[PDB]
Amino acid sequence: MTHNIHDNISQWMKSNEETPIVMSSRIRLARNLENHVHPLMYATENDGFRVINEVQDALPNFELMRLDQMDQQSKMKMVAKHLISPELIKQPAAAVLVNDDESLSVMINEEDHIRIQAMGTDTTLQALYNQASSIDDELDRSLDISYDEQLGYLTTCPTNIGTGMRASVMLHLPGLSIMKRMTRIAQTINRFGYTIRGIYGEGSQVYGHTYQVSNQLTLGKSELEIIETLTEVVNQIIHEEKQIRQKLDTYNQLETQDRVFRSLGILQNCRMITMEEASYRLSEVKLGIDLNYIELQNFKFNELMVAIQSPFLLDEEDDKSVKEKRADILREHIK
C-alpha cells in the first residue's frame, strides 16, 4: 500500500552486520548569512522568499520541497526520516532543499542557519566530511558568509561559534540496559564533557533498542580532534557492550534463548500490537540474531523501526484499525 518499506536502501542500512552495534552517523554545519537582518526574526514572508530564492539560484543542481505545498501527513513522514526538526514545521517561511540521491540536505531558514547536514555510511565520518566540504567550496565561493577572524564562523552563541560541526553516532545497546549499566557509564562519559541521547521515538525507553552519542563543545578546537575523540570514545562502548554479550552467551544461554524465541513467537501471530511492545520485541530478536540463533532480516531492522511509527498509518483511519494494520505489516514482513 504505502511506499516507504523499500524506497530507502543505502549502504548504511545494508552492510550493518559486521559491526551491528552501530547504526548510522551524522555531521552538521551551521552558518548564518550576510546582507540580511537576522534571517529568522522578521514579520512577513519577504525575508523568507529572499533567502529562499538566493540559496535556490545559488545551486541549480538540487530541487526544493516547500512547506506550503505539503500537508501534515507528508510533513511527519519526512520528520520521522530525520530530515526535519519541529521548529522548521513551526515556521511559515521555512523550506527544505534535498538531493534526490538522498545523502545530503539543507534546511533553509530553520533556525539561524542553513545547516548543510550529511548522513551516510558506517565506514568513516571523513568521507561524509569531504562531501560536505566539496559542497562548501561551491557555496562559500558563490557568496560571502559572515566569517570572523578572532572567532571562526558566527552562527549562534551557546551552540556554534568556532565551527558549526556537530557529529553523532547511532548505537544499539541492549545488554547494558537489561543489566542496568547505563547511568554509571553515562557519568563516566560525561567525565570528558560529551553526551548520550535518546532514540527514534520516546525518550523513556529503559531497555535501550537505540542510543545516540554526540559532542558538546564545538568551541576553541579543530575538527579532526573532535572526530578522533568521539571515534575513540565509541570503540570503548562497543567493547563494553561485546563484553556483557560473550558473558551471557557462555554463562546462562537458556534464559536468553527462551526470551528471544518467545518474543519472536509473539511478534508474528498477534494481530493487535501496539508500539512499545513491537519495538522491545524487535530489539530482542535482533540480539538473538547477533548471537547466531535465528535467521531473519539483519538489514531491514532499521527499515521496520522507521516504518512502524503512527503518523504513517493514523492519517487514514482511527487508531483501532491502525493497530491491526501495524500488526499486519509486522506479521507480513518478518516471515
Partner 1 sequence: KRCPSCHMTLKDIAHVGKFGCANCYATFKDDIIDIVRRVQGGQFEHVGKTPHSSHKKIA
Q: Which of 18, 100, 148, 318 binds partner 1 (CB under 8 A)?
A: 148
Cell of 156: 549562534
Task: Please tell me whether residue 165 adopts helix, strand or coil conformation.
Answer: strand
- Our finding on whether 157 is near partner 1 (CB under 8 A) is yes
Cell of 211: 542510543
Report the side by side order of strands in the sheet with 63-64.
Answer: 63-64, 97-98, 104-106, 116-120, 22-29, 165-171, 211-214, 195-197
187 vs 250 by CB, closer to a second copy: 187
34 vs 63 by CB, closer to partner 1: 34
28 annotated as belonging to a binding site for a ligand: yes
228 vs 319 by CB, closer to partner 1: 228
262 annotated as belonging to a binding site for a ligand: no
Kindly identify the residues of this chain, within the stretch 23-62, that bind a second copy according to CB under 8 A: none
Instruction: Find which of partner 1, a second copy, none residue 272 binds, CB within 5 to 8 Å per kind.
Output: a second copy
Q: Phi and psi (nearest 5°) for 95?
A: -160, 180
Q: Phi and psi (nearest 5°) for 293?
A: -120, -70
197 annotated as belonging to a binding site for a ligand: yes
Instruction: Find which of a second copy, partner 1, none residue 148 binds, CB within 5 to 8 Å per kind.
Output: partner 1
Which helix (H) or strand (E) segment is 170 a member of? strand 165-171
- Our finding on whether 41 is near partner 1 (CB under 8 A) is yes
Kindly identify the residues of this chain, within the stretch 192-221, that bind partner 1 according to CB under 8 A: 192-193, 217, 219-221
32 vs 302 by CB, closer to partner 1: 32
* Distance (Å, whole) CA 235 – CA 55: 39
Give CA 65 to chain center in angstroms.
20
Q: Which of 9, 65, 127, 151 binds partner 1 (CB under 8 A)?
A: 151
Give CA 109 to chain center in angstroms.
20
Compute the radius of gyration of the chain from its Cα atoms.
22
- Our finding on whether 20 is near partner 1 (CB under 8 A) is no
* Distance (Å, whole) CA 40 – CA 12: 34
Cell of 109: 531558514
How many residues touch a second copy under the rule CB under 8 A: the total is 22
25 annotated as belonging to a binding site for a ligand: yes
- Our finding on whether 265 is near a second copy (CB under 8 A) is yes
Q: Which of 125, 264, 282, 330 binds a second copy (CB under 8 A)?
A: 264
21 vs 33 by CB, closer to partner 1: 33
151 vs 206 by CB, closer to partner 1: 151
Instruction: Find which of a second copy, partner 1, none residue 100 binds, CB within 5 to 8 Å per kind.
Output: none
204: CB partners within 8 A, 6+ apart: none
Cell of 16: 550493518
Per-residue string for binding with a second copy, 174-203, x by CB under 8 A?
-------------x--xx-x-x--------
DSSP states of 47-64: HHHHHHHHHHHH-TTSEE
Task: Please tell me whether residue 115 adopts helix, strand or coil conformation.
Answer: coil
- Our finding on whether 224 is near a second copy (CB under 8 A) is no
Nearest alpha-carbon partner for 109 in 160, 72, 167, 67 = 67
* Distance (Å, whole) CA 122 – CA 115: 21
Contact between 30 and 159 (Cβ < 8 Å): yes
168 annotated as belonging to a binding site for a ligand: yes
Known binding-site positions for ATP = 24-28, 82, 115, 166-170, 197-202
Known binding-site positions = 24-28, 82, 115, 166-170, 197-202
Interacting residues toward a second copy by CB under 8 A? 158, 187, 190-191, 193, 195, 216, 254-255, 257-258, 261-262, 264-266, 268-272, 324
Interacting residues toward partner 1 by CB under 8 A? 32, 34, 36-38, 41, 112, 136-137, 140-141, 144, 146-158, 161-163, 192-193, 217, 219-223
